[model samples]
Target: MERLSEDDPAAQALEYRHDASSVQHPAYEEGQTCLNCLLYTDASAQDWGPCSVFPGKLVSANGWCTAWVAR
Candidate 1:
């Protein structure tokens, strides 16, 4: 999978924020992150992993997005 950097253009387009506290999405809640989101594909205990939101990219476990969902 492609590695999605925090500053990637695509990530910025999606309004993905590296810090969950900085997310402006209505669904955003304290402590929510990619690691605990339903779209995350990493089964291992890694800090970064693949996400369904960005098909070919890996997102930070601590990242937040508008698409975030409970896992």
Candidate 2:
């Protein structure tokens, strides 16, 4: 897939936000993103990359979700 859209059911389950600043998620922090999350898998992606949180899905480096964890 090109990238994971927020409309994806899996993304919705985790409350994924392409632009972390676009929403007010209680799980979000001052400095947290998919790039720094354990599920991001490919930190070298720099923009969007495959994420373990959603099988066969690419997530934005700047995105945030409830599944995010310190990498």
lDDT (CA) per prediction: 0.80, 0.86
Residue 66, candidate 2: Cα error in Å is 0.2
Worst 10 residues of 1 by lDDT: 40-49
The most accurate candidate by TM-score is: 2
Per-model TM against the reference: 0.78, 0.91
Candidate 1 lDDT over 1-71, as tens digits, reads 76787688888877897667777776678889888888988746367788987988878888888888899
Count of backbone collisions in candidate 1 = 0
Residues 1-71, candidate 2, lDDT per residue (tens digit)? 77888998888899999988775877678689888899899889989899986887889999899988998
Model 2 scores a TM of: 0.91
Indicate the residue-level lDDT of 65 in model 2.
Answer: 91
Off by over 4 Å in 2: none
Off by over 4 Å in 1: none
